[PDB]
Structures are given as structure tokens and as C-alpha cells.
Write a protein that binds this DNA or RNA. Structure first.
Ligand SMILES: [Mg+2]
Ligand SMILES: [Mg+2]
Ligand SMILES: [Mg+2]
Ligand SMILES: [Mg+2]
Ligand SMILES: [Mg+2]
Ligand SMILES: [Mg+2]
Ligand SMILES: [Mg+2]
Ligand SMILES: [Mg+2]
Ligand SMILES: [Mg+2]
Ligand SMILES: [Mg+2]
Ligand SMILES: [Mg+2]
Ligand SMILES: [Mg+2]
Ligand SMILES: [Mg+2]
Ligand SMILES: [Mg+2]
Ligand SMILES: [Mg+2]
Ligand SMILES: [Mg+2]
Ligand SMILES: [Mg+2]
Ligand SMILES: [Mg+2]
Ligand SMILES: [Mg+2]
Ligand SMILES: [Mg+2]
Ligand SMILES: [Mg+2]
Ligand SMILES: [Mg+2]
Ligand SMILES: [Mg+2]
Ligand SMILES: [Mg+2]
Ligand SMILES: [Mg+2]
Ligand SMILES: [Mg+2]
Ligand SMILES: [Mg+2]
Ligand SMILES: [Mg+2]
Ligand SMILES: [Mg+2]
Ligand SMILES: [Mg+2]
Ligand SMILES: [Mg+2]
Ligand SMILES: [Mg+2]
Ligand SMILES: [Mg+2]
Ligand SMILES: [Mg+2]
Ligand SMILES: [Mg+2]
Ligand SMILES: [Mg+2]
Ligand SMILES: [Mg+2]
Ligand SMILES: [Mg+2]
Ligand SMILES: [Mg+2]
Ligand SMILES: [Mg+2]
Ligand SMILES: [Mg+2]
Ligand SMILES: [Mg+2]
Ligand SMILES: [Mg+2]
Ligand SMILES: [Mg+2]
Ligand SMILES: [Mg+2]
Ligand SMILES: [Mg+2]
Ligand SMILES: [Mg+2]
Ligand SMILES: [Mg+2]
Ligand SMILES: [Mg+2]
Ligand SMILES: [Mg+2]
Ligand SMILES: [Mg+2]
Ligand SMILES: [Mg+2]
Ligand SMILES: [Mg+2]
Ligand SMILES: [Mg+2]
Ligand SMILES: [Mg+2]
Ligand SMILES: [Mg+2]
Ligand SMILES: [Mg+2]
Ligand SMILES: [Mg+2]
Ligand SMILES: [Mg+2]
Ligand SMILES: [Mg+2]
Ligand SMILES: [Mg+2]
Ligand SMILES: [Mg+2]
Ligand SMILES: [Mg+2]
Ligand SMILES: [Mg+2]
Ligand SMILES: [Mg+2]
Ligand SMILES: [Mg+2]
Ligand SMILES: [Mg+2]
Ligand SMILES: [Mg+2]
Ligand SMILES: [Zn+2]
Lengths: 89, 220, 111, 138, 68
RNA sequence: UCCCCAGCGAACCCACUGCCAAGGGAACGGGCUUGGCGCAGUCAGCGGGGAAAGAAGACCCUGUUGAGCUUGACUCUAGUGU
RNA sequence: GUGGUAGGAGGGCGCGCCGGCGCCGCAGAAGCGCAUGCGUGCGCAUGCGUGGAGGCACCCGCGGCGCAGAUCUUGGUGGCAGUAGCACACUCGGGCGCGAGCCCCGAGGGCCGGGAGACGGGUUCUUCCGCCAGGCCGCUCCGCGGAAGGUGAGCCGGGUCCUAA
RNA sequence: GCGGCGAAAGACCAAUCGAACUGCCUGGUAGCUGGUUCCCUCCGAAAUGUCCCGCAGGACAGCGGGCGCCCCGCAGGUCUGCC
RNA sequence: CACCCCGGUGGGGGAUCCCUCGGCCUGCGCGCCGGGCAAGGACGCGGACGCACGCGAUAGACGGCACGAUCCUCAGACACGACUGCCGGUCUCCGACAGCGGCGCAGCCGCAGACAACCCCCCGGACUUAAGCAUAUCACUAGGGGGCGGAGAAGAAACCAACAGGGAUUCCUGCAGUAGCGGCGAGCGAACAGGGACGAGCCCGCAUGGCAAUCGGCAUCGCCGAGUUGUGACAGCGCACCGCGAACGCCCCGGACAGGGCGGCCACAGAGGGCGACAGCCCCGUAGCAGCGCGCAGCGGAGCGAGUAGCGCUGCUUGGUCAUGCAGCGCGAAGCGGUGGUGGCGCCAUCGAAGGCUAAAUACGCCGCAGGACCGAUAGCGCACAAGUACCGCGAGGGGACGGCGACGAGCAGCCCGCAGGGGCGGCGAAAGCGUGAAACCACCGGGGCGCCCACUUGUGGGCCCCGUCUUGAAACACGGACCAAGGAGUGCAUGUGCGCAGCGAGUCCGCUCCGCGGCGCAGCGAAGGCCAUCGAGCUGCGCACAUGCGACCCGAUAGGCAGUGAACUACGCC
């Protein structure tokens, strides 16, 4: 009753895909992601010290940041076509 | 070892009271954590960087030991007792002139030490190069070789370039003698070749008997 | 505690106590020497130090001795023949809040 | 001694630099000494080995053989010389991989712009020897 | 010489007794109990620890009172 | 169902274990002492014993360890009111 | 003169690494196995076998430095035990096949749900090929393994509609 | 969640409820239980006194060991004598 | 026959040892996010492509420049540039809007979101210590909220002082575990100096009146706007920045020479790594070698700070004491005011609040670099491996395991048997055949039957209960222990004390720093006013023992708190 019989009724799925963080944590009734806190503007304060190691900055692709490290290393010379045009004048 | 949410499961579960790793579904789950006897546990009394790495020694007592380690180099029974092959060497203390600075190339410097009877000493050190016998060879200490000739010089006879590459030759300025050169391995009697500039400065750094040192303030 | 000893005054009860180790101390010294050399090379003829006055130390423990002050008063710079704003352009430090107290400290700094 | 603090004497970093060298560096690490007849002409000690280089083997089983380089493989660092071979079971002859340090170049290939690259190292060696001659002159 | 632990390897109850023990803090922490159960320690070795003596000087100045 | 077989094939538990009688012993022994016996080490039943296994006794006491709860406990406090 | 718990002390043995110093090693290092010897003892040395690249001794120095126990931790392995247990309404013939109680076909005898949607699953669907792995036995079978194929909307459902709490 | 909710059982609130679950403070504290790793050599106890919200604990004293220093006569004894 | 013990061979398992493209620690460097669409996510992208990693419809090298011949599993590509390196392009979609705000504003902009180590502001615990506990402590911490930057914050005295006076801030040393606070209990606890690092100073407001001399915008030398409720000022920057780098042969052993032997050679290079064993001379490297320029102009200067200061009350805070700071409320200033370790008043002394900016010394993770008396695959990060992966949880979250042939040249399928897996004769190789291969345990074989000790003529006799542990007392019908391997517990720091050792000694202490008249000692007593010896070896280091604070020998509570997540089970209510 309390255990094995009651697990047959667990066919609802409350936490669905979050559109911000992509974890299966967006609640349907609550309309809030339990992981990242969407749709609050700021990110939810992560519930563990390891949660930054899993989900924080640097754990993803860092598509813009890897470009701006490379430009900062070279001195922010920017677009190579426009670099020669500013140098001629 | 402390990166878990581990708790003791308590008594009553026929298992020891050590903290168990929380969660399920992995092999790490329910295993012991946090303890020094646990696998992947924190070692009890972890090592800290606030350990006192350096040791203080009184400066006057360190200066006496530098003086006594210097006197050990002047005793030919001590120098051959610590492994230096000093049969060919003229005197001990062997003092070379301040025209040592006119040697420009180390081929002429190796020839100069050869005609001082140090050829067997340098060859003993060069062939003694072997791989260290422990895990120190992993930690950037792969090769050990013996300690050979120490050359003490001063700033007016600077022979650093022409001599530093000869295997078995260490160079030390006379203004700063460490005991790591004078008794390497806590074994007195390092084979030391002096320049004339460094030798004549010894009565200035340490003074004479009963007198203060001129170059070292307040040393007797 | 057990025996005869001085009563313990060890203040490590706070778990928030930090430790400042000094492993950078030989390295900071070589950085400090390098910056001083680069300052001297940036101001090649000009001395790296300001000219600072000789002041007497404050309390009764220390008024037997003099030390090197912060800057000269503008009335000291005027008696020496200088405008204090001109005096800063040459390597003289100027202190606007020190009071010209007596003739002995005044005439020593003017000289 | 190495007095440059910015370069490693570390074994771990030197070993990682050898096995994760990129292809430009792996070409340089696969250099081979020249003969004395090549060193009187070119002057430099060694040069990176290439296909169609004549080579005498200096160490190993094939020591003393001469042959052309037929294959260089930068990953696993192996030069395959013509007439340094071993058969498989099915009679197929396989070239045996020799390290470039065990090969000495007898005749340098000069076809695909390599004569430019040899002369660039030769001239920079000649120019740098002129500067060191003037500095020791002064 | 080496530490005492290097000799106590092999003996149960490292140096602290089987019937007694090395427990965590019997008696309390610090110098507590100076009027209750360590009163014999304070009557013997620090009989002037407790109480007040004399006129307080809020911020005694060392350099002003310097007179060696 | 068991039992017997082909194939498949665990767990509990495990200081070490020939069996009794009395004695002594931490005052109820498988081992000690003194006696009585049994030992080819197999199959099936069985529940006398192993003070059988479960579970760091839930009873009780102790702890200057708690928590739930109460009020004429102590010290405070939201609320109401002035 | 000689016992010894708690306990204190001394001197050594052993381990990782350090500064030295004597050396050894592809003519075989460490490690390991079995022997022999030394040693009151911690332990040490050798022989043979294995091993295939490092190591030893001593003096120094640093220490995460010695285990039978902690319902210790982790890993491995036993006994228990070929035991408990696991299909026991099917039967006969035929087929493919190396191989058949279970796969296929025919017959006989029985039994009970079956077929559509949702949620949930997500390719399990279907075809071809397979299997010496998985299926509480076996399999030629399969919700398994491999390769493919398949989901077509103005009218079905949702959105491009409406509001409920 | 010192919150819900309860035709009231302290029931139920994800196999958890007389205050859920997660992470942290936190290696909470424990006068309590368990364990605490080489050898030989030298010596070797106490389970008593006083006090303590003290009675499963401490501190002091006693006893053990180690380290010393100093040349002062020393004794768990008998004898004699007096209380 | 079984059983047990010992050995041999074979299993079994993965200890040991050796290795290590990993970790850890320290130092240094960098310190650069975002509507130009960030962090993160989703989905796609390879000829054969799952994972990983890369990437964005220009989707598995697009361009420029440099490099210069391979990449590779197949197929192929390639001097019309392979493989690479550096930089730049392209860069889907979700994710920063009910947006908010500035500027006369045809319009142009900004804020949001990330980062959470360092730093600033606000909010703010409890465990804990006090042997209970309530104030105290933990702690003005953890934690939560907000906000920056490469540092931040602070900062040019309404300061310190009491002198013969010093002179921003920050940091170090030091004052000092001191004055002081404190159930005056536990405990807590600064400041001026002195020495040092570093140094740097400035500004708005009350600016002309013979004319706003000032600024913003534009479609621009002219409009429009701001503005008289008042606008107004230039001294600092930039570029360049290499390619080369010495020196070895023979013999022996071996699968192979980097080994051994002999003989040389180079070295401003004998750091390190690779190479078939241990290489200065085989290779990569290593030592070594290279700079500069361009700028700085003018016109006000006594301006001054109010619902403040202060006082009263309250709450918090602090070492701050008849109040240190902060806030709220009531009261509410002055031309003189503030302050003087903090009762009032008076003196004297010293400063000028209620406006603003300010380098440097200081702090610090990611990351990069370099090191190390660190760890060496149960260790070291959780991860040396398709690791925050597999996997689990509704969710917040939780979170592993797993390293090794060789010269990367060979290592095969010839024959017989089997449906096959395979077996046997073979095959390759120095050997191993994804290093070594311990123990538990197992198969077979061989030998032997006490579990141990003693004795000897080896099977007899004699002696032995089960270890650990707590206990008055354990073989106990006390508890823990199936076995084996590996791991596994008095440590670190601070401050003391004692002892030993060491240097110097009325002195002593290098290590903050570029240079301690700083500490302690040479003499104490008292609450103090005051008194002052008839007098005394210390200082510093090293080592041990011990005490205390810290996680404190290791492991262990029930609890308490802070911040979060769940009504898919279940409870009720509504549609
Ligand atoms: Mg339901
Ligand atoms: Mg729901
Ligand atoms: Mg670990
Ligand atoms: Mg070793
Ligand atoms: Mg014990
Ligand atoms: Mg003890
Ligand atoms: Mg007791
Ligand atoms: Mg009392
Ligand atoms: Mg059967
Ligand atoms: Mg009986
Ligand atoms: Mg009997
Ligand atoms: Mg039976
Ligand atoms: Mg029974
Ligand atoms: Mg109990
Ligand atoms: Mg009590
Ligand atoms: Mg004895
Ligand atoms: Mg003992
Ligand atoms: Mg060893
Ligand atoms: Mg040994
Ligand atoms: Mg340990
Ligand atoms: Mg063990
Ligand atoms: Mg034990
Ligand atoms: Mg089993
Ligand atoms: Mg059966
Ligand atoms: Mg049936
Ligand atoms: Mg259906
Ligand atoms: Mg199907
Ligand atoms: Mg099958
Ligand atoms: Mg009831
Ligand atoms: Mg429930
Ligand atoms: Mg602990
Ligand atoms: Mg005795
Ligand atoms: Mg008693
Ligand atoms: Mg007890
Ligand atoms: Mg005592
Ligand atoms: Mg056996
Ligand atoms: Mg393993
Ligand atoms: Mg770092
Ligand atoms: Mg983008
Ligand atoms: Mg391209
Ligand atoms: Mg923000
Ligand atoms: Mg704590
Ligand atoms: Mg308490
Ligand atoms: Mg307590
Ligand atoms: Mg309590
Ligand atoms: Mg920034
Ligand atoms: Mg600032
Ligand atoms: Mg405090
Ligand atoms: Mg103005
Ligand atoms: Mg070279
Ligand atoms: Mg006010
Ligand atoms: Mg005044
Ligand atoms: Mg005062
Ligand atoms: Mg101001
Ligand atoms: Mg291992
Ligand atoms: Mg690991
Ligand atoms: Mg569950
Ligand atoms: Mg193997
Ligand atoms: Mg006892
Ligand atoms: Mg009892
Ligand atoms: Mg016992
Ligand atoms: Mg009994
Ligand atoms: Mg048991
Ligand atoms: Mg062990
Ligand atoms: Mg301690
Ligand atoms: Mg705990
Ligand atoms: Mg409480
Ligand atoms: Mg809460
Ligand atoms: Zn989300």
C-alpha cells in the first residue's frame, strides 16, 4: 500500500525541461525551475558547493569568453580586415 | 577527502558508525568517507603549509660554524677522509693567483685544474653521475653526482663563466659562504681551491684572534 | 589543565582565524628591489628620495632623538627663499599641517 | 646549467611536450645528423628528416644500411627507410620504423623547395657566426 | 631524539591507560572550573587569579610613563 | 509441495569447533579437571542445545546528551491593550 | 642483580624521502616464491627460481614512518553449497537445423480475456540476418545482437481561439 | 516544514513524520563505548586523602619514572629511660 | 575414501615493486564578460561518426600570415601547400523587458544577466566554549541579499599628543596577549609611538558684467538646445623586439647501447627530455648573443558645507570602561566650533566635521608560467582512463569505478579434429604476448597426519582453553573477530613551563626592513600617592616532555541552526 503498490501511481512528471538551464527541473505547477530558478532574472543561488563545479561558468562552451581571452592576449586588435584599413589611415 | 555530504548511518544497521557517502545508484554510495581509515578519506592531521619550514639559528653561532667548516678544508686528513682524491694536489690549502681571471675558455680552465693535480678528482665526480635510487628521480632530482672541488673567489677574481661547467667544480663568492658548500652533507673537509683575492679576505671577514673582524661587525 | 604553568592565553577559539604565511617574502624582496631600480631609471638624474626635514620625536620617551620628518612647512620654505609649490617641483617634501614650533627646528630645516 | 627561469628543466613538462608536440614541432624533433660531406657544404649540425632523403642507419639492427627515406610518421616519431624491412607472415614486406636520431643523412633531398629551407638555415648560421665573430673581435 | 609516539607503537592505550583513557575533554576546556573543580589548581598555583586589584587606568600610555 | 534427476543456482551465518556426567570456574562449559564414551566423517527427518541468528535493550538506571509536550518553573517574546 | 599490568626511560630494528659518502645492475635491479644461514628479538644476509630496470649500505636531515582487532575502510576470496531455490495442461506427428520438451507446421486436449485511447516508455514496431552472450532450463526463438525500413492530415489531437479555478 | 493538512490516529505531507527532504555550519560536542601499529633493555604503580551540580569525571596531595644537585650521617628495628 | 598440513605445477585474485602526459603545494604572471546578445543551455554539423572533443547553416581548418611534406582505418587529399601554429571571420535557437532610465529627443544612449577567490555595503545564526546555563562565547563568523574592480576599500586630520611635540591612507614590524572589557567567569582585547615598506597630492561651492567668457546635439561654422533657480578650463603617450647555437670513434655483452673497456673532443653549453638499457659530444634543447621615439597651451581664486553637529532617549555594536562606533526618534546649534581613553564644569592645548577625488606599498581564485626534502593509481584533486562521466534522486542534489606487451618491425592461421567456441602439432619474437603477479582460496600431483611449546631414537610423553577488550575477576553462557591483501589512529601551529644542548653574556636577539636604540635582562615594592635595594645571569636558538587553544589520537551521537527542494505517494479545498 504505502510502498510497492503506491509506485504504480507515479505516472505524472512534475519537473520538465527548463528552457534556460536545460535540466529536467522546471516545475509545471510552480512554473519555476528548481535548479536555476527560471523565470527569475538572476540565477538561483546554487544549493551546494559542488553545484558551481557542475553548472557554473567554465563548465560549458565559453564561446564568447574564449574569443575575448584570445583577443586580450593579442592586444584587442580586432577584425583583421579592418585592422589594416585603420593602419593605412 | 572532505568533499562529501557524508553522515554516520548510526547504529542498528549492522554496519560501522563511520560516515557513509550519501545517495544511491553508484558504487561510491554508502561507502565510508571522511575518516583516515577510509578509502578516499581525509587523512587525519592533514599536512599544512603553516608548518614551520625554516629553523632559526643564532647568527654568531652560524658564523662560528662557518669558521670551523672553513678550517676543516685546511686539514688534508679531513679532505681525503670525505672522499676527495687529493694525492696530486700540491698543498691544501691550495691558493691560486688572482691571474685566474685571465682564463677565458673552460678548456684552459680544465687544463689549469689538470696541472693542479685535480684531474683524478674531477674524473671521479664526472663518472659518479648516476640516477637517484628513489622516487626522487620522478621529482626533478633524477641525477646524483658526487661533490668535487669548491672554488672560492672574490669580486676582483671573477671566474664564473670559465669554470661553472666543469663537472666537479662549484664556485662560491667569499662574501657569502654557505655551509651547503663548506660541509655538503654535514661532512667536514670540502676540497677547496682559493683564489688569492678570497684567501686574503679571510682575515677581514672573520678577523684575527682576539680582534674584531673588520668586514663583519661584532664578530670574534 | 594540570600543572603549574602560566595561564593559557591562546586565542585560537575562533574558527575564522586566518594565517598569513610569508612564502612570498624572498620573492617580494626581489620584486621590491626591481621596482626601486626601475624608479631610479625612470628619474635618472633626480634622486629617488625627497628631501625631508629633521623633526624631534614626540613623547618623553623619544624626544631625546630626532628622526626624518614628512615635509617642510611653507614658512620654512619661504625663509629658505622658495615658494612651497616650487619646492615640490624640485625634490623637497612639503607638509602643510606641521606647525612651526620653535627656532631650533625651524632654523635647522631652513638650513 | 640552464639560467633561463622561463624554460623548464621539469621532466614531466618536457615529457608532455614530447608526446603532445604538434606537427610543426614534431618535424623539428625528428631531425637527423648530416654526414661530414654534407656538413662541409651546409655547415649545420643536423636537419629535420624528410622523404626521399638518402640515409645511413647508425644504430639498431639495420646499422650500416643505406637507403632512401620512404615514409616519415610524426605521430609515433618513426622514419621508414627503404631497404630496412621485415616480412609479415603472408610474405608482405613491411618497412621497419627507425627513430630519426639513429639515422644519418648522406644526401639531402632538394626538390620541393627544400633547397630554399637548407639555404635559409645555412645563411642564418653564416650570418650569426659573423655577429659572434665581430662581438669576440670587440 | 625522536618523539614519544615512535616508542608507543605496539602498546594498546598509547600512553594514557586502559582504565583511565585519553578522552576528549574531561574536566572541561581551558582553565574553567577555577572556583569549582580546579579550585585546588588555583588555590595552589594562581591564588591571585580571581578578583580585582586597584585603580583602573583606561589606556595607560607606555611612552609617557617611560622612566627606566 | 517435499523426495529423486537434467540444467540453472543464491543468502543468512562463520574466533575455532567429536559427544556426555559431575566438579571447579565470572556462582548454568564444546574446549578446563576427573571420569563416561564416540569417531569412513553419508542420506532424510528433526527442533533438546549451541545461554542459536536477527538489532550497539525499546524496560531500568546513568549522562550536568536530547526532543515532543505542559504549566503556578526561570528569563524573554509576537499579539492585544494603555 | 634479574617477575611484571597501567606507566616512565634507554638503546636499537624497520619504512618514504633528503643532504652526503662508499658502491652495485641487461654477464640481470627492485619485487616475488622456496630454501639455507645469522639473530635473545625487532630483523638481516645469501642460494636457487622468477622478474626485466633500477637499487643497496652507512652517516645525516625531514616524516602522512611499523597493525590482528576499531559491528574498521576498500578490494578480493572461502565455507555454507551443487544446498535453499528456479517451468512442472499439455500430448502426438512433421519441418528447418550441428543441436529441439519449449522454434515453426498439422492434429488432439484444454485454458482465458482480447481489442482500442491517455499518462508513462521511446524504436521496444516491422523485415532480413544472427546467436555458442542475455532470457531463473534450453532455443534454430525473442521485447536480445546486427543491418535496414517505417510515423505523410484544411477535416484526428494541440498551437495559430476562448475562458475556468 | 515550528509549516501544511487532518470526520483527529500525532494520522498524512514521495517506502521518511511527536517537526519531511537537500546542502551547509560540521571533522557539532561527548565526563560515554570502541580502537590505538616494532623489538629488546632498565625501573615500576594506584584503586587512597581533600574539594568539586561531585559520585562512569576532575584538580590537588600520595604512590611510579626520568633528570639532577649536595656531603648534612641514615633506620616501618632492638635496648635503656621518662611521659 | 574423505579431511587436514607442507611442497611442486596450474588456476584464482591484483598485493608488491618499478613506472607516470596526473595531482598537490608554493612562487610569479595575468586579471580581459555582457543587446556588438554574455554565463549557461537546447538542437544541429564529419564521406563512411556512436562517445568524447571540436564546431555553428561559412557548422570536424573559412580567410590572412607563418610553416613546408605528410595526414591515414578505408577511401582519398596534397607544393594551385599536406600536417600544423598564430590571429581574424562566420558564429542557429533558448537564456538578460508588463521593462526601467538619461539627453530636446528627426534621434542617440545606458541599466538588467554572468562572475562570488579577493574587496565594499546591508541582513545575520546556531552547533560550540563556559564542564549545566540565560549575559558572554562561537562571532560583528557561517550563511543570505546587494555591488564593484584588476584590485577594492581607505585617504590628505574637526588626527595624535601633553613633547624640545609629531603630521593623509594602506601594509609590515612593534606596542601586546598589553591598557582594558568580561556571570571581572569562560574568555575577549585595541591605540599612539619607535622602526620599515611605499610615498602625492588635490578639487567643487560665492568666477565676468564693457554683455555665459561654458556645454550638448545636428542634416555643422549655421541652427537648435542646456544654462543666469548660474555654465566655464590638456599633459601625457607610442613603436620596435632575432634566429642560429659546440663537440665521438673503435671493441665487448646484448633483441637493441645510452652499459663495460680503450682512446679522444666540446664547454659563456656537464639544466632537462627523447632516442630499442644509464648519452655533455645522436636529437630536441641548454650557455650565449638585438632597441627606441613623440608631446605639454589659458583668463576666477577667503571659496566652507543645517533638520546637520550636539544633547536626550532607545536598540545594536566595540577592548572602549558614568559610552567606542552606528542607527532611529525627540530636541536642535554656532560664529566660532570639535576634541583632548571619553561624568559635569573650567582651563590650557590641538584641530576645522556635517561636500568630492586620489596612484603606490596591500588582498586574491580561475587561468598561464616556473618550481618543490609533496603523493605515486585504495595515494595524490571527486577525475592519471569516453569525470562531474556512467549512474541515482520528483526535486534541491548525490556521485564512482577503471593506468602499463613490444624495437608501433613481427606477433600467423599452415595441417589434423570440432557446427562452433576452440583443441593439438606448429608459427612470430630476446622475452612478454593489455609489465611484475604476493596472499586468501582452488585443481591435480607428491610427501606427511599434534594446533602450538619441550624432550628425544617422529610418535610418544609432559605442558598448553580464544584472542582482543572493559573489568575486583574472562576459556567464559561478557562484547568484537569468516578469510586475505592494501589502507588505517598523539599530528600541525600558537603561547608557555621544565630539562638537555648551543652561541654570546650585563647584555642578548640576522631573517619587519634597504638599516629593531623593538623585546627581554642588568632590582625590586605598593591600589596609589609614594618608596627604591643590604641583592640576583640573562638573552636567543635548537630538541624533547607536558599544559592550553585550535578538527587536536582516530571513528561515533540524539540534537541545534542557516539556506534551500518537494502535494508524481498522501491529506484537504477549488475548477
Ligand atoms: Mg495520482
Ligand atoms: Mg502537480
Ligand atoms: Mg584521498
Ligand atoms: Mg623504493
Ligand atoms: Mg582503550
Ligand atoms: Mg603518559
Ligand atoms: Mg574510572
Ligand atoms: Mg558548586
Ligand atoms: Mg537437481
Ligand atoms: Mg556437562
Ligand atoms: Mg576431558
Ligand atoms: Mg542432516
Ligand atoms: Mg535448538
Ligand atoms: Mg546498549
Ligand atoms: Mg554529574
Ligand atoms: Mg624485567
Ligand atoms: Mg607496558
Ligand atoms: Mg630502501
Ligand atoms: Mg636495510
Ligand atoms: Mg599514518
Ligand atoms: Mg589486517
Ligand atoms: Mg591490538
Ligand atoms: Mg560467498
Ligand atoms: Mg534443489
Ligand atoms: Mg501452468
Ligand atoms: Mg494497444
Ligand atoms: Mg518484433
Ligand atoms: Mg544463445
Ligand atoms: Mg496519543
Ligand atoms: Mg510516508
Ligand atoms: Mg575527531
Ligand atoms: Mg623489578
Ligand atoms: Mg576508590
Ligand atoms: Mg566503564
Ligand atoms: Mg597528580
Ligand atoms: Mg598446497
Ligand atoms: Mg585497482
Ligand atoms: Mg596555483
Ligand atoms: Mg552568440
Ligand atoms: Mg583554411
Ligand atoms: Mg547584476
Ligand atoms: Mg566547531
Ligand atoms: Mg556548555
Ligand atoms: Mg561539556
Ligand atoms: Mg547542554
Ligand atoms: Mg571586470
Ligand atoms: Mg578607490
Ligand atoms: Mg569578540
Ligand atoms: Mg562654477
Ligand atoms: Mg646544437
Ligand atoms: Mg539625528
Ligand atoms: Mg578650541
Ligand atoms: Mg587623557
Ligand atoms: Mg573634506
Ligand atoms: Mg598498485
Ligand atoms: Mg583516486
Ligand atoms: Mg526513493
Ligand atoms: Mg600478467
Ligand atoms: Mg584494573
Ligand atoms: Mg562485572
Ligand atoms: Mg580475555
Ligand atoms: Mg558462565
Ligand atoms: Mg560475530
Ligand atoms: Mg598495512
Ligand atoms: Mg596537544
Ligand atoms: Mg560527527
Ligand atoms: Mg539549543
Ligand atoms: Mg528552514
Ligand atoms: Zn532551469
Amino acid at each position: 500500500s504505502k510502498g510497492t503498490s503506491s509506485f504504480g501511481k507515479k505516472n505524472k512528471r512534475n519537473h520538465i525541461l527548463c528552457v534556460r538551464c536545460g535540466s529536467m527541473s522546471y516545475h509545471k505547477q510552480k512554473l519555476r525551475c528548481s535548479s536555476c530558478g527560471y523565470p527569475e532574472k538572476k540565477l538561483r543561488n546554487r544549493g551546494s558547493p559542488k553545484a558551481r563545479r557542475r553548472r557554473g561558468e567554465g563548465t560549458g562552451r565559453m564561446r564568447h569568453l574564449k574569443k575575448v581571452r584570445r583577443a586580450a592576449r593579442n592586444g584587442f586588435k580586432g577584425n583583421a580586415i579592418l585592422r589594416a584599413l585603420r593602419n593605412a589611415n | 577527502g572532505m568533499q562529501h555530504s557524508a553522515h554516520s548511518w548510526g547504529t542498528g544497521r549492522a554496519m560501522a558508525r563511520v560516515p557513509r557517502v550519501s545517495g544511491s545508484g553508484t558504487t561510491r554510495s554508502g561507502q565510508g568517507a571522511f575518516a583516515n581509515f577510509c578509502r578516499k578519506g581525509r587523512l587525519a592531521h592533514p599536512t599544512k603549509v603553516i608548518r614551520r619550514w625554516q629553523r632559526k639559528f643564532n647568527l654568531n653561532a652560524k658564523r662560528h660554524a662557518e669558521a670551523m667548516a672553513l678550517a676543516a678544508t685546511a686539514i688534508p686528513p679531513l679532505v681525503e677522509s670525505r672522499g676527495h682524491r687529493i694525492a696530486g694536489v700540491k698543498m691544501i690549502p691550495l691558493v691560486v693567483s688572482n691571474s685566474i681571471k685571465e682564463i677565458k675558455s673552460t678548456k684552459e680552465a680544465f687544463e689549469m685544474l689538470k696541472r693542479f693535480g685535480l684531474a683524478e678528482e674531477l674524473a671521479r665526480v664526472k663518472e659518479s653521475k648516476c640516477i637517484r635510487a628513489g622516487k626522487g628521480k620522478m621529482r626533478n632530482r633524477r641525477y646524483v653526482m658526487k661533490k668535487g672541488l669548491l672554488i672560492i673567489y672574490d669580486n676582483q677574481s671573477d671566474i664564473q663563466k670559465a669554470f661553472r661547467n666543469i663537472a666537479g667544480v662549484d664556485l662560491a663568492c667569499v662574501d657569502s659562504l654557505s655551509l651547503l658548500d663548506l660541509c655538503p652533507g654535514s661532512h667536514l673537509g670540502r676540497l677547496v681551491m682559493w683564489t688569492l683575492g678570497a684567501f686574503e679576505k679571510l682575515n677581514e671577514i672573520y678577523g684575527q684572534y682576539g680582534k674584531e673582524a673588520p668586514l663583519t661587525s661584532g664578530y670574534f | 589543565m594540570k600543572h603549574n604553568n602560566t595561564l593559557p592565553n591562546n586565542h585560537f577559539k575562533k574558527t575564522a582565524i586566518r594565517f598569513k604565511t610569508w612564502f612570498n617574502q624572498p620573492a617580494k624582496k626581489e620584486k621590491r628591489i626591481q621596482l626601486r631600480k626601475e624608479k631610479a631609471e625612470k628619474m635618472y638624474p633626480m634622486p629617488v628620495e625627497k628631501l625631508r626635514p629633521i623633526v624631534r620625536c614626540s613623547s618623553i620617551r623619544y624626544n631625546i632623538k630626532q628622526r626624518l620628518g614628512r615635509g617642510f612647512t611653507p614658512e620654512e620654505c619661504r625663509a629658505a627663499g622658495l615658494d612651497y609649490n616650487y619646492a615640490r617641483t624640485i625634490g623637497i617634501a612639503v607638509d602643510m599641517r606641521r606647525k612651526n614650533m620653535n627656532k631650533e627646528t625651524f632654523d635647522q630645516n631652513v638650513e | 646549467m640552464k639560467f633561463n627561469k622561463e624554460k623548464t628543466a621539469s621532466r614531466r613538462k618536457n615529457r608532455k611536450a614530447h608526446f603532445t608536440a604538434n606537427s610543426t614541432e614534431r618535424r623539428i624533433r625528428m631531425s637527423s645528423p648530416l654526414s661530414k660531406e654534407l656538413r662541409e657544404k651546409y655547415g649545420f649540425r643536423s636537419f629535420p628528416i624528410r622523404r626521399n632523403d638518402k640515409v645511413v642507419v647508425m644504430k639498431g639492427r639495420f646499422k650500416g644500411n643505406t637507403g632512401t627515406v620512404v615514409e616519415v610518421r610524426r605521430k609515433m616519431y618513426k622514419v621508414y627507410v627503404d631497404s630496412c624491412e621485415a616480412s609479415k607472415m603472408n610474405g608482405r614486406k613491411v618497412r621497419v620504423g627507425i627513430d630519426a636520431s639513429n639515422l644519418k643523412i648522406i644526401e639531402l633531398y632538394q626538390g620541393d623547395g627544400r633547397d630554399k629551407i637548407l639555404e635559409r638555415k645555412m645563411n642564418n648560421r653564416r650570418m650569426q657566426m659573423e655577429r659572434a665573430a665581430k662581438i669576440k673581435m670587440e | 631524539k625522536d618523539k614519544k609516539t615512535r616508542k608507543l607503537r605496539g602498546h594498546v592505550s598509547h600512553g594514557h591507560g586502559r582504565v583511565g583513557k585519553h578522552r576528549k575533554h574531561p574536566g572541561g576546556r581551558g582553565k574553567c572550573g577555577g572556583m569549582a573543580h580546579r579550585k585546588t589548581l588555583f588555590m595552589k598555583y594562581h591564588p591571585d587569579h580571581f578578583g580585582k586589584r586597584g585603580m583602573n587606568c583606561t589606556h595607560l600610555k607606555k611612552n609617557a610613563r617611560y622612566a627606566p
